[PDB]
């Protein structure tokens, strides 16, 4: 209805969560899904836990030793992702001298079955550009597609559209305008958006440089 009301739906205001061990997170929520961007300090353990929600994790900057179930893997920035199905224990250590920036999606929606690869970690692959100039890379599982998109500056654009797939995402680069229904927000590093099925959305990068985004489809839209 109103601007504020749409903004709070589609571009929820984040809360900052701080842990005793020094991890800070920015949490944004719409209904069945939470996006959490975490800053994990050098040489820090993230204690293992487990929960009924599924969790998808990816590193955006730095390098993170991640453990899902009994699989431990080194996660490289923008080249790694895993799914921890409901109740599978997971934890991590930033074993480096550098901060780690990560994103987690935590989700529990009716009528979704949360499969994962047998060893949890997904394999990235390129495809042809989504639109010319807009390079994308994906991880895909039966119920979720993760699309990393580089939107060029100087008017790189995703035309305004809708689809039945739910689509949630986060700017992980400089910035661009994103619009959902009646609300346009200037995306910054970390800004999350949530589109329910059929809500119209599009984006335009008017800055002078490319911006990156992680865009996640429930269920897959491109690699079905
Ligand atoms: O492919 C789609 O459905 C999209 O919405 C893609 C997208 C990519 C980058 C910014 C906004 C939307
Ligand atoms: Co978790
Ligand atoms: Co879309
Ligand atoms: Fe939802
Ligand atoms: Fe320009």
From Swiss-Prot:
<dbReference type="InterPro" id="IPR013096">
    <property type="entry name" value="Cupin_2"/>
</dbReference>
<feature type="binding site">
    <location>
        <position position="163"/>
    </location>
    <ligand>
        <name>a divalent metal cation 2</name>
    </ligand>
</feature>
<feature type="binding site">
    <location>
        <position position="55"/>
    </location>
    <ligand>
        <name>a divalent metal cation 1</name>
    </ligand>
</feature>
<dbReference type="GO" id="GO:0005737">
    <property type="term" value="C:cytoplasm"/>
</dbReference>
<dbReference type="GO" id="GO:0017000">
    <property type="term" value="P:antibiotic biosynthetic process"/>
</dbReference>
<dbReference type="InterPro" id="IPR014710">
    <property type="entry name" value="RmlC-like_jellyroll"/>
</dbReference>
<dbReference type="Pfam" id="PF07883">
    <property type="entry name" value="Cupin_2"/>
</dbReference>
<feature type="binding site">
    <location>
        <position position="49"/>
    </location>
    <ligand>
        <name>a divalent metal cation 1</name>
    </ligand>
</feature>
<protein>
    <recommendedName>
        <fullName>H2HPP isomerase</fullName>
        <ecNumber>5.3.3.19</ecNumber>
    </recommendedName>
</protein>
<feature type="binding site">
    <location>
        <position position="167"/>
    </location>
    <ligand>
        <name>a divalent metal cation 2</name>
    </ligand>
</feature>
<dbReference type="GO" id="GO:0005506">
    <property type="term" value="F:iron ion binding"/>
</dbReference>
<dbReference type="GO" id="GO:0016863">
    <property type="term" value="F:intramolecular oxidoreductase activity, transposing C=C bonds"/>
</dbReference>
<keyword id="KW-0479">Metal-binding</keyword>
<keyword id="KW-0045">Antibiotic biosynthesis</keyword>
<comment type="function">
    <text>Part of the bacABCDEF operon responsible for the biosynthesis of the nonribosomally synthesized dipeptide antibiotic bacilysin, composed of L-alanine and L-anticapsin. Bacilysin is an irreversible inactivator of the glutaminase domain of glucosamine synthetase. BacB catalyzes the allylic isomerization of the endocyclic-delta(4),delta(8)-7R-dihydro-hydroxyphenylpyruvate (en-H2HPP) to generate a mixture of 3E,7R- and 3Z, 7R-olefins (E/Z ration of 3/1) of the exocyclic-delta(3),delta(5)-dihydro-hydroxyphenylpyruvate (ex-H2HPP).</text>
</comment>
<keyword id="KW-0413">Isomerase</keyword>
<dbReference type="InterPro" id="IPR052535">
    <property type="entry name" value="Bacilysin_H2HPP_isomerase"/>
</dbReference>
<comment type="subunit">
    <text>Monomer.</text>
</comment>
<keyword id="KW-0170">Cobalt</keyword>
<comment type="pathway">
    <text>Antibiotic biosynthesis; bacilysin biosynthesis.</text>
</comment>
<dbReference type="InterPro" id="IPR011051">
    <property type="entry name" value="RmlC_Cupin_sf"/>
</dbReference>
<feature type="binding site">
    <location>
        <position position="161"/>
    </location>
    <ligand>
        <name>a divalent metal cation 2</name>
    </ligand>
</feature>
<feature type="binding site">
    <location>
        <position position="222"/>
    </location>
    <ligand>
        <name>substrate</name>
    </ligand>
</feature>
<feature type="binding site">
    <location>
        <position position="51"/>
    </location>
    <ligand>
        <name>a divalent metal cation 1</name>
    </ligand>
</feature>
<feature type="binding site">
    <location>
        <position position="201"/>
    </location>
    <ligand>
        <name>a divalent metal cation 2</name>
    </ligand>
</feature>
<feature type="binding site">
    <location>
        <position position="90"/>
    </location>
    <ligand>
        <name>a divalent metal cation 1</name>
    </ligand>
</feature>
<keyword id="KW-0408">Iron</keyword>
<feature type="domain" description="Cupin type-2 2">
    <location>
        <begin position="150"/>
        <end position="215"/>
    </location>
</feature>
<dbReference type="GO" id="GO:0050897">
    <property type="term" value="F:cobalt ion binding"/>
</dbReference>
<keyword id="KW-0963">Cytoplasm</keyword>
<feature type="domain" description="Cupin type-2 1">
    <location>
        <begin position="40"/>
        <end position="105"/>
    </location>
</feature>
């Amino acid at each position: 209805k109103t601007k504020e009301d749409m903004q709070e739906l589609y571009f929820p205001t984040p809360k900052l969560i701080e842990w005793e061990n020094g991890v800070r997170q920015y949490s944004t929520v719409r209904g069945d899904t939470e996006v959490l961007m975490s800053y994990v300090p050098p040489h820090t353990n993230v204690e293992p836990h487990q929960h009924k929600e599924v969790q998808i994790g990816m590193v955006v900057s730095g390098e993170l030793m991640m453990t899902v179930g009994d699989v431990t893997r080194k996660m490289t920035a923008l080249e790694s992702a895993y799914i921890a199905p409901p109740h599978v224990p997971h934890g991590a250590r930033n074993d480096t001298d550098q901060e780690v920036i990560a994103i987690d999606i935590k989700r529990l929606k009716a009528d979704e079955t949360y499969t994962s690869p047998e060893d949890y970690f997904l394999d990235i692959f390129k495809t042809r550009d989504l639109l010319p100039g807009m390079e994308v890379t994906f991880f895909v599982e039966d119920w979720v597609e993760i699309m990393l998109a580089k939107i060029p500056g100087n008017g790189g654009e995703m035309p305004f559209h809708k689809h039945r797939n739910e689509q949630i995402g986060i700017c992980i680069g400089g910035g661009y305008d994103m619009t959902v229904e009646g609300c346009t927000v200037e995306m910054k590093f970390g800004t999350a958006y949530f589109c329910e099925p059929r809500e119209d959305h599009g984006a335009i990068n008017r800055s002078e440089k490319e911006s990156k985004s992680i865009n996640i489809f429930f269920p897959p839209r491109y690699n079905r």
